[PDB]
């Protein structure tokens, strides 16, 4: 299977079928998003708009998930029942959260087949995030009154952010229901997001898993780890760009400030996760709306128990949103420990050396002695290489599930990431 023999058929037999399949599977979702956007411009009553997006969400859920969408429908009905029963309370967040938790647990306890649950994990995660965020917004006082049935439904079934789309606050969805003019900035954002989504899709499917033997003349257990990591990262970037494309096509995802309308919904940042500065930056820039949801709700609610327990329960809730499945809770707990130890070691070195080696670039007001130079840049490059190593190790699980499979993968990778994290923690203990 010579390199030239691979490339002679690469273009056609990989770039055309995968792009064509992406288009054939997302064209109807894009059409329905555009139809809802155009229909929310005629100036119908608000409840008509919410009913329209409810019907659009029903049709989209049916198209993607053939008939197993009854689980998402029952999750929405149950979330509304729990929000209505506790509409006058101040605990709405914890009530909706316990309801969501019990639902996901009873689901994973063989309420539905493993394949269909793996298929609908994303839709149910978005519905759960939306319901819990609305509960906590009503609790804290950032949303005035509880929504009517049709408003709550049209929020959960927003045709833009139902299948792929990110979590958007209830007020973002309300502003979307208001609608904004179909300017040239809007179409520019939608077209650019679709182009980047298709580019990242074809990269993840064609160039990712086949770059180290062919695209680079270099070549192994770590080269394949980096290949799989990059393939999964670019698949997720495709999903993110497509999600923001649909959320901007439906109308949502804008920030109107000072009567200046910028369609600036960003879901992922590929240049911050591929060329990282620190694992905290990777976790932040991987999924930006999901990071905002997690940080804000879970972390601000549980910070009272100390920062370490707060981030631990943050990652626990992150693994629970997905539904308890191995290779997705082990990875997330390893991420918790890695980011914690890395940020702590960065703070300790930036204290003992007063240098600019923090986990995030220092603001201009910091009294650090080494703002620039060679030591700071070399140490930042070292920590970036460690972050790339951790990312490749963790993403090796996505070679192109079973606990035995994960232990096998990490054992054939010799557990080097956990050893490195433990060594960094011991080093922090010895320094401080």
């Amino acid at each position, epitope marked *: 299977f010579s390199r030239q023999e691979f490339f002679q058929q690469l273009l056609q037999g990989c770039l055309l079928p995968t792009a064509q399949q992406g288009l054939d599977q997302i064209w109807l979702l894009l059409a329905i998003c555009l139809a809802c956007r155009l229909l929310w411009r005629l100036g119908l009553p*608000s409840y008509l708009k919410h009913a329209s997006t409810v019907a659009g969400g029903f049709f989209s859920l049916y198209h993607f998930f053939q008939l197993h969408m009854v689980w998402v429908v029952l999750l929405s009905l149950l979330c509304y029942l729990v929000l209505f029963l506790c509409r006058h*309370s101040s*605990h709405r967040g914890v009530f909706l959260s316990v309801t969501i938790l019990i639902y996901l647990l009873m689901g994973e306890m063989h309420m539905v087949d493993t394949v269909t649950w793996h298929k609908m994990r994303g839709a149910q995660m978005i519905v759960a995030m939306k319901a819990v965020s609305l509960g906590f917004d009503l609790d*804290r*006082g*950032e*949303v*005035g009154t509880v929504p009517s049935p049709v408003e709550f439904m049209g929020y959960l079934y927003f045709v833009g952010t139902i299948v792929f789309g990110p979590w958007i606050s209830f007020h973002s969805y309300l502003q979307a229901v208001q609608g904004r003019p179909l300017s040239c900035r809007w179409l520019q954002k939608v077209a650019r997001s679709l182009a980047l989504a298709l580019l990242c899709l074809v990269l993840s499917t064609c160039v990712g898993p086949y770059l180290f033997p062919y695209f680079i003349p270099l070549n192994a257990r770590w080269l394949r780890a980096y290949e799989s990591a990059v393939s999964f990262h670019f698949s997720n970037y495709f999903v993110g760009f497509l999600s923001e494309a649909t959320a901007t096509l439906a109308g949502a995802g804008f920030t109107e400030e000072k009567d200046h309308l910028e369609w600036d919904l960003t879901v992922s940042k590929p240049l911050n996760v591929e060329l990282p500065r620190s694992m905290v930056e990777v976790v932040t820039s991987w999924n930006l709306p999901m990071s905002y949801w997690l940080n804000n709700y879970v972390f601000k*609610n549980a910070l009272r128990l100390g920062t370490f327990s707060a981030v631990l329960v943050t990652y626990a809730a992150s693994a629970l949103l997905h539904g308890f499945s191995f290779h997705l809770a082990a990875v997330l707990l390893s991420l918790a420990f890695i980011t914690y130890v890395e940020h702590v070691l960065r703070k300790r070195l930036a204290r003992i050396l007063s240098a600019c080696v923090l986990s995030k670039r220092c603001p201009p007001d910091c009294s650090h002695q080494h703002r620039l130079g060679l030591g700071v840049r070399a140490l930042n490059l070292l920590f970036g290489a460690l972050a790339i190593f951790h990312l490749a190790y963790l993403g090796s699980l996505f070679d192109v599930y079973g606990m035995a499979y994960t232990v096998h993968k990490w054992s054939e990778l010799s557990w080097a990431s956990h050893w490195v994290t433990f060594g960094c923690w011991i080093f922090y203990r010895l320094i401080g």
Partner: antibody, heavy 119, light 107 residues
Framework: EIQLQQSGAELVKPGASVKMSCKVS????????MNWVKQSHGKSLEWIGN????????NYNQKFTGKATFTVDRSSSTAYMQLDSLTSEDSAVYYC????????????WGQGTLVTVSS | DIHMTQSPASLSAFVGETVTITCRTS??????LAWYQQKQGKSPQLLVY???TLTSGVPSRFSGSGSGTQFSLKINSLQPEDFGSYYC?????????FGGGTKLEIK
């Protein structure tokens, strides 16, 4: 028969600090937000913020951040507000207002604590 | 944030007359607008919430209406205990801002 009994009047020198109290009575104190409302002498009402008594998480108006601090004491079921570095413009009446359940309207109000600053 | 322009700033009427107070909003609030009534010296009192829904105890002579950015409160058959100050307040989302106020006086 909900009754949000509030503290007495106050007369402090500028730059000092005051800590009002709104002793609640009539319902489960930790089940409804406690909106704090400021009204000048014959002017419009202004919303300072609200403290959620279940988990103590405040939400301040951007104008009154740093100028107001909400603390609650669920043992005696009284909500407090502190004013830091009082200026001559804070001679107003401050109400405590319970949020009307689902909506965030102010169903039950206190009676007001006349705060006046002078020398 | 959201600004609540309320007119008129003052209003005189008789006993049994019909009056209407308007509260125009600088943004869309989806009919989230409450109406209070502060008498001379007392604390305010919620009369109408959700711009249409009366509360428990307020008589039937009050009736809120409107939606979007132009709301109104119509008080028919003014009784002597209907005279005070009326402050419209949106409950769309934090921060909550009240209106200017309408001093309803007898004459």
């Amino acid at each position: 028969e909900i009754q949000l009994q509030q503290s007495g009047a106050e007369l402090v020198k500028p730059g000092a600090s005051v800590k009002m109290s709104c002793k609640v009575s009539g319902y489960s104190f930790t089940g409804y937000n406690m909106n704090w409302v400021k009204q000048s002498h014959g002017k419009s009402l202004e919303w300072i913020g609200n403290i959620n008594p279940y988990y103590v998480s405040t939400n301040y108006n951007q104008k009154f951040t740093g100028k107001a601090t909400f603390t609650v004491d669920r043992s005696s079921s009284t909500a407090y507000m502190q004013l830091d570095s009082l200026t001559s413009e804070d001679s107003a009446v401050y109400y405590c207002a319970r949020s009307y359940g689902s909506s965030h309207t102010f169903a039950y109000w206190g009676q007001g604590t006349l705060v006046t600053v002078s020398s | 944030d959201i600004h609540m322009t309320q007119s008129p700033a003052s209003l005189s009427a008789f006993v049994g007359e019909t009056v209407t107070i308007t509260c125009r909003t600088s943004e869309n609030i989806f009919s989230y607008l409450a109406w209070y009534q502060q008498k001379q010296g007392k604390s305010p009192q919620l009369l109408v919430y959700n711009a249409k829904t009366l509360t428990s105890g307020v008589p039937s002579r009050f009736s809120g209406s409107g939606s979007g950015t132009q709301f109104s409160l119509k008080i028919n058959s003014l009784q002597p205990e209907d005279f005070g100050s009326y402050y419209c307040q949106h409950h769309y989302g934090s921060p909550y801002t009240f209106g200017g106020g309408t001093k309803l006086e007898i004459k």
